[PDB]
Amino acid sequence: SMIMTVPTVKLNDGNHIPQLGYGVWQISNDEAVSAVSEALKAGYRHIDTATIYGNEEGVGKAINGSGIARADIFLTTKLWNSDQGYESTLKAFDTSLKKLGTDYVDLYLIHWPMPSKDLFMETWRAFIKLKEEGRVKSIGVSNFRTADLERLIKESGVTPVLNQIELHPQFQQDELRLFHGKHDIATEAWSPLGQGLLEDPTLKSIAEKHAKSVAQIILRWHIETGNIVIPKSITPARIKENFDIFDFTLNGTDHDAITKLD
C-alpha cells in the first residue's frame, strides 16, 4: 500500500520539478498520445518534449484528456534553433501553446546554443519576457556548454533553472555538473539510460545486489547524484519499469563502481 513519493528538485526560481519525467523524442503525434497517456497512467507527472519533434499536438491531447488537472502535471518544451531570436521565439511559443492546447508551460528550454550566442541571448531575452508575463513558469536551456552559460548569466543577470544535457554512465559530464553546482543550475539528463550498458558486468552486478533491473540501477544512480532524468522508452513495460526507482537506494561502493564506467 506504500506509494513512493517522487522527489522534486527545488529550482533557483523557487519552482519545483519532479526529478523523474517522461521523455518524448522523435515519435509521431499518434505515438506521443499513446506514450504520454501511458506515462501519466503509470504515475509520471512530468512530461518533456521539444517543438522540433513535431508531436506537441499529441502530447497536448494526452495531457488535456488524462483526467489529471493541468496544475498537477509539469510540462516542458523547447524552442528550436530556426526560431531563435526575440520576436521569432514569441511567435514560436504562441504556436506551441496553440498546438499543446494549454495557456502556459512549466518549463521552456532553449534547445541548443546554436547557431550563435547573439541569437540565443535574444531568445533568452524573449524567455525572460514570457516568464515576466506568467506564461512560462521556469526558463532554462539544453545542450549549453560552460561558455554559453557564462555569457547567458553575465549578459542577462538571469541564470537558467537547469541545463538539459546528454548524461549517462558512459558520459558523466563531470565538468558541466561542477559548473552547474557552482552556479545553482540543476542538471537534467537526456538519454539517461545511455547505449542499450544493459550487458555491463558492474551494472548487472548492482542490479542483482538490489533485485532491480539494470535500467533501474542507472536511473537510481542519476537520482542519487542529483540529476533530473527524462528516460524516453516507448514500450509500456519500459515506461512502467523506469518509474519504479524510488523504492530502494544504492550504497557507497555502488556509486564508486559506476563512476569507474567513465
From TrEMBL:
Residues 20-261 form the NADP-dependent oxidoreductase domain. The keyword Isomerase does not apply. The keyword NADP applies. It catalyses: hydroxyacetone + NADP(+) = methylglyoxal + NADPH + H(+). Pfam families: Aldo_ket_red. InterPro entries: AKR, AKR5C2, Aldo/ket_reductase_CS, NAD(P)_OxRdtase_dom_sf, NADP_OxRdtase_dom. It comes from the Bacteria. SUPFAM superfamilies: NAD(P)-linked oxidoreductase. One of its GO terms (molecular function) is methylglyoxal reductase (NADPH) (acetol producing) activity. The active site is at 53 (proton donor). Keywords: NADP, Oxidoreductase. Gene3D superfamilies: NADP-dependent oxidoreductase domain. Its EC number is 1.1.1.-. Substrate binds at residue 111. The record marks 78 as: Lowers pKa of active site Tyr. Belongs to the aldo/keto reductase family. PANTHER family: 2,5-DIKETO-D-GLUCONIC ACID REDUCTASE, NADP-DEPENDENT OXIDOREDUCTASE DOMAIN-CONTAINING PROTEIN. This is Aldo/keto reductase.
